[PDB]
Ligand SMILES: O=c1cnn([C@@H]2O[C@H](COP(=O)(O)O)[C@@H](O)[C@H]2O)c(=O)[nH]1
C-alpha cells in the first residue's frame with residue numbers, strides 16, 4: 312500500500328526547506344506544507360515542490376473560518392496546486408461543507424482535523440472530537456487527522472470513521488508519539504522536526520522507515 | 524488601540540488591483556484594515572507591507588491561528604515581521620496555543636486578538652458552547668483584545684461581562700451576515716464590515732452610509748467616556 316510516512320516541512324526559508332526535502336526525497340512521496348513555509352516564501356512554493364520532487368502536497372492550513380472565506384481559501388490553495396487541505400471541524404458543518412464543495416469541484420481532497428495532539432487539545436477539542444468525527448462521516452468526509460500522542464483516542468476515532476476512511480496522524484517524534492503504536496490505528500504518520508531539524512535528515516527518515 | 528469611526532474594513536477581495544482600489548476609496552473613513560488569507564494566499568504576505576506603505580492604516584491579520592504552540596509561534600513571527608500590527612487567534616485549540624501567540628506579540632510589541640465565538644450559523648455546533656470558557660481563559664492569560672459576533676448581540680454582552688471594559692472588542696457579521704450594528708456597538712468597541720463595502724457599486728458611499736449610522740448612535744470618542752457608556756449599556760442589557 313501507500314508510503315506510510317508524510318514529511319511536515321515547517322522550515323521557514325526556501326533554501327533549507329528545499330535542501331532537506333531533497334535529502335529525503337527517496338523516503339517520502341507526500342509533503343505537508345503549512346503556513347510557516349507559505350507565509351515565509353509564498354504559495355508558489357507548492358508548485359516548486361511538485362516540480363522538484365514530484366510529491367503530492369497536503370496544505371496544512373487548519374482552515375477555520377466562516378463558509379464564504381473557507382471557500383476562497385480552498386480555491387486559492389487548490390489553484391496553487393495542493394492535492395489536499397487540512398480543515399478544522401470545530402467551526403461547524405457549514406464551514407466544512409464549503410471546503411468539501413470546492414474540493415469536489417476541483418478533484419482534490421479535504422482532511423478533517425478531529426483532535427489535535429498537543430496538551431491544549433484537552434481543553435476544548437477533545438470533548439468535541441467524537442462529534443466532529445461523526446459530523447465528518449455524515450458529510451461524507453473520507454480523510455481524517457487524529458493524534459499520535461493519544462493512541463486510545465486514535466482507536467476511538469478509527470471506530471467512528473471505519474476501516475475504509477484514510478487517517479493520518481501527527482505528533483510522532485518531537486511531540487512524543489510512537490511510530491509503531493500510532494500505525495496500529497492510522498494509515499500514515501506525519502513527522503516534522505524529528506526529520507527536518509536533524510543534521511542528517513535522510514538518516515532520520517531512514518530510521519523511521521526502518522522501525523515500521 | 525482606537526479605531527477611527529469604529530469601523531474596520533475586512534478586505535477579502537483576492538486581487539491586488541481591486542483590493543488597493545477599494546481600500547483607497549474608503550481610507551478617508553477608516554484607519555484600520557483587516558487582511559486575511561483570501562488576499563494573502565492570492566497576492567502574498569508582501570501585500571501587508573504594501574498596504575502599510577500606501578495607507579498608513581493599522582493592519583490586523585485575520586489568520587484564525589489554530590495550530591499547536593510551536594507552529595503558532597512561527598506563524599505569528601512571520602506575520603508580525605511582515606508588518607501586521609495585530610493577529611487574530613482561535614482559542615478552541617487551548618491555552619498553550621494562545622500563550623505561544625501572546626509570547627511572540629509581547630516580545631515584538633504587537634497585539635493578539637482572541638476569537639471567542641464566531642458569527643456564522645455553524646458556530647452554534649461547538650464554538651458557542653466553549654465561548655465563555657475561552658473568554659475566561661483569555662482573561663487568565665492576559666489577553667486584552669477579543670473578537671465576538673455581531674449576529675448574537677446578547678452573546679456579546681455576556682462576553683463583555685467576562686472580559687471587562689478595559690479590553691478591546693471587535694465584531695464581524697454586520698452587513699452580509701445580517702448582524703445588528705446598533706446592538707453590537709452597545710458592547711463592542713468597533714464593527715468589522717467586508718462584503719457590504721467591497722462588493723458595493725460605490726464602496727466609499729457604502730462606508731459613508733455605515734458611518735452615518737454609527738454616528739447616529741452618539742457613541743463618545745473619548746475612551747473614558749465610552750467606558751462609562753458601555754458600563755451603563757451592559758447594566759441595562
Ligand atoms: O494535532 C496536530 C498536531 N500537529 N500538527 C502539525 O503537524 C506537524 C507536526 O510537526 P512535528 O513532527 O515537528 O511536531 C506540524 O506541521 C503541526 O502543525 C497538526 O496538523 N495537528
Ligand SMILES: O=c1cnn([C@@H]2O[C@H](COP(=O)(O)O)[C@@H](O)[C@H]2O)c(=O)[nH]1
Nearest residue numbers: 376380533641642695699700716717718
Ligand atoms: O466570527 C467571525 C465571522 N467572520 N469573520 C471574518 O470577518 C469578515 C466578515 O466579512 P463579511 O462582512 O463580508 O461577512 C471576514 O474576513 C470573515 O472571515 C471573523 O473573523 N469571525
